[PDB]
Inverse folding.
RNA sequence: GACGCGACCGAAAUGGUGAAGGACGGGUCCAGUGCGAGACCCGCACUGUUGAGUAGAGUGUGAGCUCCGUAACUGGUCGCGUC
């Protein structure tokens, strides 16, 4: 049987200076043949720990690993700003090698409500026969947020796609865009297009809308 | 001084073939194990293949066995991944990595290349259309306005977006692309600015999609009413 | 008692022989670990507990031992010969 490496949690939120622990649980003995890596967005992984508990040369000692039978943990004794990243365990006891699913370690800060903007489709795009309506949620925390599209007050489903940025290096917030896609024919048979946002930092849902053809 | 550089990536259709190469410098591959590891967009690392020194033994992930072949040309100090019968699920950034010296770092992978993107799809190369996201005639949501550019229907990844040839960077958010059901990508780039300058300050998004020879600039302004 | 001759015994050694399996070893087989720029292959080292088929998974005329012989001798015993 290929060896499973079950990594938890899949994400965690922590303040700078906090102690955190990440766990990887092997599905059979892997002796001590376990490594941990760090990966930042857009960049290659970097080795932190080898042989389960040995510190790789040049890695700061606030990183440590330990083995307890077939459970393995990566501990950071006190997070620094540059430690927020995704971490992967790996077993190399036998082939095929196995990576854990990864743990994203994000910065915890105070709640921030998003500012919301809606953008109608441009006249240029409409010439092409499709309309895209965009809703922007700017600089919010935490990441959980709900966007609902309404077309003449009817709730849309299955015709929108969302994208979230990485947590901001300066203010530690996220931003989100949601794009509603309609044919030109369907777009022109309705008037009121609306984006409805719920976020922890909002007492009540906030709605932004426009009327097709008016300013 | 140790570096790995992969090349050979790009677009290929389902069932097609592609050879990746991994050029070592600062060490000689004959003394090390060399591994290939891939990462699908948004997902985790998945080990692909490796080749052992002195014996040349090779090992493969079940999900690629029989289709992929790892090899090494010591006289070019280069490793290779020959990929055959490619499927859409093989779309990924492919990294090569050096397994370090046993006495120094166990079986850890101590050096990694920066990766090369392999896209397996039947969609054909296409430049994007770039549409304005115009600042609202109302005004603001908190003293400031928002505007941007919609970069729609290109293939393959990546594209770059900048504002005012790089002069404008504060409050810019360029979102990761999404893959549409058409098989084409789309993304938007937005920036928040003071509403009081919408009429006097100039705002231009710069889009570059090298695979299609498409490079455009879009001035983004308010509208009639 | 000395010497001599012989026989028997003993005997370093030795030719043949055939049982014993990990408590005789192995440059026998295997497993686990470490090392050599080395997860496997190759070499070396360590560790193994029913490691583990007794003569072969062995292209050892291996050690010890069983059984059948042979035997240096500068060992013993008995007989005989001469003082
Ligand atoms: Mg987007």
């Amino acid at each position: 049987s290929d060896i499973q490496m079950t990594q938890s949690p899949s994400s965690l939120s922590a303040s700078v200076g906090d102690r955190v622990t990440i766990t990887c649980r092997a599905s059979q003995s892997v002796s001590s043949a376990v490594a941990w890596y760090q990966q930042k967005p857009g960049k290659a992984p970097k080795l932190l720990i080898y042989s389960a508990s040995s510190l790789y040369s040049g890695v700061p000692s606030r990183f440590s690993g330990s083995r307890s039978g077939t459970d393995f943990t990566l501990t950071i004794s006190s997070l620094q700003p540059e430690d927020f990243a995704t971490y992967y365990c790996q077993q190399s006891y036998s082939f095929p090698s196995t990576f854990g699913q990864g743990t994203k370690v994000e910065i915890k800060r105070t709640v921030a409500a998003p500012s919301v903007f809606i953008f109608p489709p441009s006249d240029e795009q409409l010439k092409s026969g499709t309309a895209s309506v965009v809703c922007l949620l700017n600089n919010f925390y935490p990441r959980e947020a709900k966007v609902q599209w309404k077309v003449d007050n009817a709730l849309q489903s299955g015709n929108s796609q969302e994208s979230v940025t990485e947590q901001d290096s300066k203010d530690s917030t996220y931003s989100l865009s949601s794009t509603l896609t309609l044919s030109k024919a369907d777009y022109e048979k309705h008037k009121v297009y609306a984006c409805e946002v719920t976020h922890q930092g909002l007492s009540s849902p906030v709605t932004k809308s426009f009327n097709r053809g008016e300013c | 001084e140790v570096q790995l550089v992969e090349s050979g990536g790009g677009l290929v259709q389902p069932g097609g073939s592609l050879r990746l190469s991994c050029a070592a410098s600062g060490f000689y591959i004959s003394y090390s194990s060399i591994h290939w590891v891939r990462q699908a967009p948004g997902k985790g690392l998945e080990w692909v293949a490796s080749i052992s020194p002195y014996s040349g033994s090779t090992y493969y992930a079940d999900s690629v066995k029989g289709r992929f072949t790892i090899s090494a040309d010591t006289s070019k100090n280069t490793a290779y991944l020959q990929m055959n019968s490619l499927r859409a699920e093989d779309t990924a950034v492919y990294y090569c990595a050096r397994q370090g010296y046993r006495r120094r770092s166990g079986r850890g992978f101590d050096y990694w290349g920066q990766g090369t993107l392999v896209t397996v799809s039947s969609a054909s190369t296409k430049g994007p259309s770039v549409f304005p996201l115009a600042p609202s005639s109302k005004s603001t949501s908190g003293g400031t306005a928002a505007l941007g550019c919609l970069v729609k229907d290109y293939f393959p990844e990546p594209v770059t977006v900048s504002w005012n040839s790089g002069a404008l960077t504060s409050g810019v958010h360029t979102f990761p692309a999404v893959l549409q059901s058409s098989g084409l990508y789309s993304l938007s780039s937005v920036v928040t600015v003071p509403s009081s300058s919408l009429g006097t300050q100039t705002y231009i998004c710069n889009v570059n999609h090298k695979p299609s020879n498409t490079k455009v600039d879009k001035k983004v302004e308010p509208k009639s009413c």
Summary: Residues 27-28, 30-33, 52-57, 59, 99, 101-104, 107 of chain B lie near RNA strand C (CB under 10 Å from a C1'). The longest strand of chain B covers residues 144-154. Residues A 163, 177; B 175, 187-188 surround magnesium ion (CB under 6 Å). Helices of chain B lie at 102-105.
